[PDB]
Design a protein around this motif. Structure first.
Motif, PDB file in Angstrom:
ATOM      1  N   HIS A   1       1.871   1.795  -3.566  1.00  0.00           N
ATOM      2  CA  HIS A   1       2.002   2.345  -2.223  1.00  0.00           C
ATOM      3  C   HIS A   1       0.628   2.448  -1.582  1.00  0.00           C
ATOM      4  O   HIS A   1      -0.349   2.797  -2.252  1.00  0.00           O
ATOM      5  CB  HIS A   1       2.682   3.717  -2.250  1.00  0.00           C
ATOM      6  CG  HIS A   1       4.171   3.651  -2.382  1.00  0.00           C
ATOM      7  ND1 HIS A   1       4.887   4.512  -3.185  1.00  0.00           N
ATOM      8  CD2 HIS A   1       5.081   2.827  -1.810  1.00  0.00           C
ATOM      9  CE1 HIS A   1       6.172   4.221  -3.104  1.00  0.00           C
ATOM     10  NE2 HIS A   1       6.317   3.203  -2.276  1.00  0.00           N
ATOM     11  N   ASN A   2       0.560   2.147  -0.289  1.00  0.00           N
ATOM     12  CA  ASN A   2      -0.665   2.201   0.489  1.00  0.00           C
ATOM     13  C   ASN A   2      -0.390   2.875   1.825  1.00  0.00           C
ATOM     14  O   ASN A   2       0.726   2.784   2.349  1.00  0.00           O
ATOM     15  CB  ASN A   2      -1.225   0.789   0.727  1.00  0.00           C
ATOM     16  CG  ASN A   2      -2.716   0.787   0.994  1.00  0.00           C
ATOM     17  OD1 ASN A   2      -3.516   1.106   0.115  1.00  0.00           O
ATOM     18  ND2 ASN A   2      -3.098   0.428   2.213  1.00  0.00           N
ATOM     19  N   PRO A   3      -1.379   3.574   2.391  1.00  0.00           N
ATOM     20  CA  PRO A   3      -1.173   4.174   3.722  1.00  0.00           C
ATOM     21  C   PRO A   3      -0.832   3.159   4.801  1.00  0.00           C
ATOM     22  O   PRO A   3      -0.052   3.468   5.708  1.00  0.00           O
ATOM     23  CB  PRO A   3      -2.512   4.877   3.998  1.00  0.00           C
ATOM     24  CG  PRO A   3      -3.475   4.318   2.995  1.00  0.00           C
ATOM     25  CD  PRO A   3      -2.653   3.999   1.795  1.00  0.00           C
TER      26      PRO A   3
ATOM     27  N   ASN B   1       2.293   7.875   6.387  1.00  0.00           N
ATOM     28  CA  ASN B   1       1.506   9.027   5.946  1.00  0.00           C
ATOM     29  C   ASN B   1       2.092   9.617   4.661  1.00  0.00           C
ATOM     30  O   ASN B   1       2.530  10.764   4.606  1.00  0.00           O
ATOM     31  CB  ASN B   1       1.435  10.072   7.053  1.00  0.00           C
ATOM     32  CG  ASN B   1       0.290  11.048   6.861  1.00  0.00           C
ATOM     33  OD1 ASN B   1       0.127  11.630   5.791  1.00  0.00           O
ATOM     34  ND2 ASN B   1      -0.501  11.242   7.908  1.00  0.00           N
ATOM     35  N   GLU B   2       2.092   8.801   3.616  1.00  0.00           N
ATOM     36  CA  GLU B   2       2.549   9.211   2.297  1.00  0.00           C
ATOM     37  C   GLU B   2       1.394   9.117   1.306  1.00  0.00           C
ATOM     38  O   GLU B   2       0.271   8.746   1.657  1.00  0.00           O
ATOM     39  CB  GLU B   2       3.737   8.361   1.835  1.00  0.00           C
ATOM     40  CG  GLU B   2       4.711   8.001   2.942  1.00  0.00           C
ATOM     41  CD  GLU B   2       5.808   9.031   3.117  1.00  0.00           C
ATOM     42  OE1 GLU B   2       5.641  10.172   2.636  1.00  0.00           O
ATOM     43  OE2 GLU B   2       6.841   8.701   3.737  1.00  0.00           O
ATOM     44  N   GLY B   3       1.683   9.461   0.055  1.00  0.00           N
ATOM     45  CA  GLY B   3       0.662   9.431  -0.968  1.00  0.00           C
ATOM     46  C   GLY B   3       0.305   8.021  -1.396  1.00  0.00           C
ATOM     47  O   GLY B   3       1.027   7.055  -1.147  1.00  0.00           O
ATOM     48  N   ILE B   4      -0.843   7.911  -2.057  1.00  0.00           N
ATOM     49  CA  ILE B   4      -1.327   6.646  -2.596  1.00  0.00           C
ATOM     50  C   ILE B   4      -1.043   6.620  -4.089  1.00  0.00           C
ATOM     51  O   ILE B   4      -1.452   7.526  -4.825  1.00  0.00           O
ATOM     52  CB  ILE B   4      -2.827   6.455  -2.318  1.00  0.00           C
ATOM     53  CG1 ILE B   4      -3.135   6.728  -0.846  1.00  0.00           C
ATOM     54  CG2 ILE B   4      -3.266   5.053  -2.707  1.00  0.00           C
ATOM     55  CD1 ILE B   4      -4.569   7.119  -0.588  1.00  0.00           C
TER      56      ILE B   4
ATOM     57  N   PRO C   1      -8.405  -1.849  -0.667  1.00  0.00           N
ATOM     58  CA  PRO C   1      -7.380  -0.805  -0.765  1.00  0.00           C
ATOM     59  C   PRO C   1      -7.965   0.580  -0.555  1.00  0.00           C
ATOM     60  O   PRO C   1      -9.122   0.851  -0.887  1.00  0.00           O
ATOM     61  CB  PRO C   1      -6.838  -0.966  -2.191  1.00  0.00           C
ATOM     62  CG  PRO C   1      -7.374  -2.279  -2.685  1.00  0.00           C
ATOM     63  CD  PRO C   1      -8.653  -2.502  -1.960  1.00  0.00           C
ATOM     64  N   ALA C   2      -7.146   1.462   0.010  1.00  0.00           N
ATOM     65  CA  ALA C   2      -7.552   2.848   0.191  1.00  0.00           C
ATOM     66  C   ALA C   2      -7.687   3.536  -1.161  1.00  0.00           C
ATOM     67  O   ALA C   2      -6.843   3.374  -2.047  1.00  0.00           O
ATOM     68  CB  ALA C   2      -6.541   3.591   1.063  1.00  0.00           C
TER      69      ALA C   2
ATOM     70  N   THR D   1      -8.245  -6.922   6.939  1.00  0.00           N
ATOM     71  CA  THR D   1      -9.120  -5.792   6.682  1.00  0.00           C
ATOM     72  C   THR D   1      -8.422  -4.483   7.048  1.00  0.00           C
ATOM     73  O   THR D   1      -7.535  -4.464   7.906  1.00  0.00           O
ATOM     74  CB  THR D   1     -10.411  -5.930   7.480  1.00  0.00           C
ATOM     75  OG1 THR D   1     -10.100  -6.095   8.869  1.00  0.00           O
ATOM     76  CG2 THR D   1     -11.199  -7.134   6.999  1.00  0.00           C
ATOM     77  N   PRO D   2      -8.794  -3.379   6.399  1.00  0.00           N
ATOM     78  CA  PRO D   2      -8.143  -2.097   6.698  1.00  0.00           C
ATOM     79  C   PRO D   2      -8.347  -1.679   8.145  1.00  0.00           C
ATOM     80  O   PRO D   2      -9.407  -1.900   8.733  1.00  0.00           O
ATOM     81  CB  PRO D   2      -8.826  -1.120   5.734  1.00  0.00           C
ATOM     82  CG  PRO D   2      -9.347  -1.971   4.639  1.00  0.00           C
ATOM     83  CD  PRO D   2      -9.738  -3.266   5.276  1.00  0.00           C
ATOM     84  N   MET D   3      -7.312  -1.069   8.717  1.00  0.00           N
ATOM     85  CA  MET D   3      -7.382  -0.530  10.066  1.00  0.00           C
ATOM     86  C   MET D   3      -7.830   0.924  10.099  1.00  0.00           C
ATOM     87  O   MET D   3      -8.062   1.460  11.189  1.00  0.00           O
ATOM     88  CB  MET D   3      -6.020  -0.657  10.757  1.00  0.00           C
ATOM     89  CG  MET D   3      -5.677  -2.072  11.190  1.00  0.00           C
ATOM     90  SD  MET D   3      -4.318  -2.126  12.371  1.00  0.00           S
ATOM     91  CE  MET D   3      -4.285  -3.870  12.771  1.00  0.00           C
ATOM     92  N   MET D   4      -7.916   1.543   8.915  1.00  0.00           N
ATOM     93  CA  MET D   4      -8.334   2.966   8.808  1.00  0.00           C
ATOM     94  C   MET D   4      -9.649   3.039   8.021  1.00  0.00           C
ATOM     95  O   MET D   4      -9.697   2.480   6.903  1.00  0.00           O
ATOM     96  CB  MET D   4      -7.283   3.795   8.062  1.00  0.00           C
ATOM     97  CG  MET D   4      -5.847   3.398   8.349  1.00  0.00           C
ATOM     98  SD  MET D   4      -5.267   3.883   9.987  1.00  0.00           S
ATOM     99  CE  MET D   4      -5.335   5.674   9.841  1.00  0.00           C
TER     100      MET D   4
END
Ligand SMILES: Nc1ncnc2c1ncn2[C@@H]1O[C@H](COP(=O)(O)O)[C@@H](O)[C@H]1O
Ligand SMILES: Nc1ncnc2c1ncn2[C@@H]1O[C@H](COP(=O)(O)O)[C@@H](O)[C@H]1O
Ligand SMILES: N[C@@H](CCCC[NH3+])C(=O)O
Ligand SMILES: N[C@@H](CCCC[NH3+])C(=O)O
Ligand code: NA
Lengths: 506, 505
Positions: free
Chosen positions: A260-262, A253-256, A500-501, B197-200
RNA sequence: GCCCGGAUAGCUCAGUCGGUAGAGCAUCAGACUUUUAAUCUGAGGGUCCAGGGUUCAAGUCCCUGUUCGGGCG
């Protein structure tokens, strides 16, 4: 037009659906893939027509040239390779069917060709169709951008568009999958057992990393997402399985940011009756073999700041250079700092901070000895780690869960692998002392995790498991994303992630 | 007593540590594995003593017996194997350290023995120890029962104890790992690509379920955990990758029972230019090859409830049985249920109601024909599917993301693999039509707002991806946990899970 | 919140000394039985960032602003 084209295409498709013309057939029999077709029928000479053979292929049109009223050139693109389709009326079923099918086909359509191989006068492997069947119309616009898509905002938000327009992303993902497969094969050959530890831990853990708090309504209790499978792997090693491994997903639970990725993928293994010196050779062999197998040789060219930046040529010859931290750091600093056993002494911290101030370096507001050294090693030692390099035992301050040195005082039995001035491989020596582990967990919880709250961050179950007897064992961790970026010449973590988030719009 | 034993052993270990000797050595140079040792030296004649080399093995003591004051028998268990060590004063380093190490060692300790291979005249393979080094003392007392701990709570909560005492648990986990490895190898050799694939997700989607809501700190937003990696696979297929697959974890916010878990692992693949009938052979070959390669034959003995009850025999002979859902339902019922095409709204509801009242099938949510017919097919069709059996051509209103039947109407293109009266894997023919897909998503959203809880919201990204053109593809999904349960003769999901999520104290 | 420079077809930009908005890319229509980033012809396409003053006439002067790139709090 961005909007009018979509409306016109949707209206045309609806009209086709109305008058008994289905544009979404259920099944198309693809006899041969595009790659096989190109591999086989490339021996043809220019201006040939193999009328005897008729095959069915399928793919997405990427161009449409109208050389005349009866000659149309399409460019099917599938499996990362292209194939021209030369639709000629004389070789079609009928002129009426030809002009009917050609009208409804545009760029980006998913179609199924049924035709005969051949080549044109200029010379190009093309399948002359006998009957083109539409499989999936493309309502939206597909831009005809030369040199590929470059806007690094729709590439990550719309990955399918990036795959359609750009071709190197498929190679990047293939290389990532090959890396994962090679790691699995190597660890399985060594005799390891793949495991799947729970991702919902009851205790968050005494780790600095922020956990993803989740609520379970049926058990009306809080579950914390996995940060590392370390504790469960050590519990299994206690159970009797001496060699375990898992390539799983960890959530932080850090920044993107750029790198870096969640959520990310890490490969973690633990083997019994070994140590960091035993894992050094294993890591050397695994990394060198992976580099040799994914690429064509041991040499890798990397661009840390894009193609326009400096290009670094690293060599992955199995004899990696090994440097011990304290002996090398003192030389890099230019002076011999106090002995390791003086780690807790405030005088050593003050003199080290004096060295950092003298060399004009920046340190976080916490002026602890750990910060000063981690900065010193990260800006005098890893800078010279252009080639793969092994960093030996580190002081006990940074790594809590590592055993003390065999002979040296206050040095954790651990090593790190640095390539491209970055950290990829970390390996500790597990601490199997129940009392020492309990004390370390309690102090770690009280320090920051539970500084002004309840002291429940300790894992009583893990301490009880360690009380039953953990064999002298050693762990190892790998960040798959970093290796993927290093092997695909990617300077962004989003280049190797499928989806990617991203920050939501609006 | 266990508390007293722990106190005494802790005091003894403290005394061991204070007077120089280290009870936790850093590194033991293990030369040869225990299983290799047995396989190599099983050829010894009973009574030989190879006093010319020294091998160093390691393991955990599980029993000690003193045959007088000079001979002491230990037995180490390593990789599920047995090595009896007969320590004697004569061949030890000397008497003093011999008696000291015999006084120091107890049952449950993890030790390392350097010695010479041999065998007693009785016929038990042994290693004569030259110097026994204690690697890790065991503070707690290992229970001494000739059957291993049987309390389910103690077995599940403390998995390390289960592995230490019970022996079949390791075999179950090895079988599960081999299942996953075989699936990966088969899909790789078919040409598939492994993806992550993303889990969130920003919004829930993929399958009917209740999601795990989590909060993001830096960005003020709620992330819903993965339910099924389904939409992302189809977006990737739209991208250009025809074949994709992923074996991954899915999270479901249901209760915990003997079959369902908050988290599980499933394998999902998608193939372009195929259909469910194409997957009917691929999954059949999958299952048959897996059973042959792991079990060793095509016949499996499974106990539905307990090892003392009935033991069903399931044959995985590759020519499985393909059964039409509607036709077999009619055959079981005899009476001809009106045709799927009409859907006979507010007519077939009464019809299914008379069936449930007369044929005596319980109907807790009598609402909708879906629940009722599911009840009928459960009570009349899957009950006889002992051997693996495909159930094809299910009604359309069952599946919201399966393409309509090409020949029939009101029927979805799908099948389910029923083995031992339980579904393991199912396949769909993907709905590549964007307008239909948007209409069905709107219906699901309306149900979620008022009418349903497991329905998904509108995923505009997937709608755009389908608008860009999705080829005719087929998807397939298998629950790894149920296959592992069936292949290990386990009727409880907690057996095939390393650390099953029990309720707290 | 101080200050600088822009805001032009669906997109990228000329627009000149103000004499009414064009060039390229994109879409569509037409011709071209051997093209490959297809080759031409034509059409639509903005109503000059908004409001004004000014000028014989204002995108092409000036005054208020919004937005963008920002240089700065
Ligand atoms: N937020 C994150 N995003 C991506 N990778 C991460 C993140 N946090 C940790 N990692 C990776 O986790 C691996 C192990 O890091 P550590 O736990 O510090 O040893 C490294 O490869 C890191 O790059
Ligand atoms: N909460 C759960 N815990 C464990 N397995 C589950 C749970 N919910 C569904 N399943 C199984 O996981 C699979 C999900 O559907 P499928 O992957 O298509 O087979 C099926 O085998 C379900 O029975
Ligand atoms: N968990 C560590 C592995 C090293 C061994 C743990 N004591 C990592 O993240 O790399
Ligand atoms: N998980 C789905 C895949 C198909 C996707 C929905 N049409 C299944 O196995 O049925
Ligand atoms: Na033109």
């Amino acid at each position: 037009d961005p909007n009018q084209y979509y409306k016109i295409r949707s209206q045309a498709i609806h009209q086709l659906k109305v008058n008994g013309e289905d544009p979404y057939p259920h099944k198309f029999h693809v006899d041969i893939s595009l790659t096989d077709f190109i591999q086989k029928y490339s021996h043809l000479q220019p201006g040939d027509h193999l009328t005897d053979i008729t095959l069915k292929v399928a793919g997405r049109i990427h161009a449409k040239r109208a050389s005349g009223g009866k000659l149309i050139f399409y460019d099917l693109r599938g499996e990362g390779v292209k194939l021209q389709v030369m639709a000629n009326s004389r070789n079609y079923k009928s002129e009426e069917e030809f002009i009917h099918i050609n009208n409804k086909l545009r760029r980006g359509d998913i179609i199924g060709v049924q035709g005969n191989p051949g080549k044109t006068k200029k010379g190009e492997l093309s399948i002359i169709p006998y009957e083109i069947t539409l499989l999936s119309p493309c309502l939206h616009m597909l831009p005809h951008l030369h040199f590929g898509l470059k806007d690094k905002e729709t590439r990550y938000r719309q990955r399918y568009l990036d795959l359609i327009l750009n071709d190197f992303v498929r190679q990047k993902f293939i290389i990532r999958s090959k890396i994962i497969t090679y790691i699995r094969s190597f660890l399985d050959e060594l005799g390891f057992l793949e495991i799947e530890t729970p991702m919902m831990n009851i205790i968050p853990g005494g780790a600095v990393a922020k956990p993803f708090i989740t609520y379970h309504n049926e058990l009306d209790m809080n579950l914390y997402m996995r940060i590392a499978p370390e504790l469960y792997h050590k519990m299994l090693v206690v159970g009797g399985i001496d060699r375990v491994y898992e390539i799983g997903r960890q959530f932080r639970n850090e920044g993107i940011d750029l790198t870096h990725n969640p959520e990310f993928t890490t490969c973690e293994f633990y083997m019994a009756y070994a140590d960091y010196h035993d894992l050094m050779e294993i890591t050397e062999k695994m990394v060198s073999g992976m580099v040799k197998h994914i690429t064509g040789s041991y040499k890798v060219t990397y661009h840390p700041d894009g193609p326009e930046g400096q290009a670094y040529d690293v060599d992955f010859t199995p004899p990696f250079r090994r440097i011990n931290m304290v002996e090398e750091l003192e030389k890099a600093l230019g002076m011999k700092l106090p002995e390791t056993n003086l780690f807790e002494t405030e005088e050593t911290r003050k003199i080290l901070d004096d060295i950092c101030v003298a060399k004009a370096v920046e340190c976080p507001p916490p002026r602890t000895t750990a910060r000063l050294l981690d900065k010193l090693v990260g800006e005098f030692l890893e800078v010279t780690c252009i080639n793969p390099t092994f960093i030996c035992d580190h002081p006990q301050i940074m790594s809590p869960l590592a055993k003390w040195h065999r002979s040296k005082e206050g040095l954790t039995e651990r090593f790190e692998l640095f390539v491209m001035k970055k950290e990829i491989c970390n390996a500790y020596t597990e601490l199997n002392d129940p009392m020492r582990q309990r004390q370390l967990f309690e102090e770690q919880a009280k320090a920051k995790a539970a500084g002004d709250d309840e002291a429940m961050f300790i894992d009583e179950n893990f301490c009880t498991a360690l009380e039953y007897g953990l064999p002298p064992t050693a762990g190892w961790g790998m960040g798959i994303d970093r290796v993927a970026m290093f092997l695909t010449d990617s300077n962004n973590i989003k280049e190797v992630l499928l989806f990617p988030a991203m920050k939501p719009e609006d």
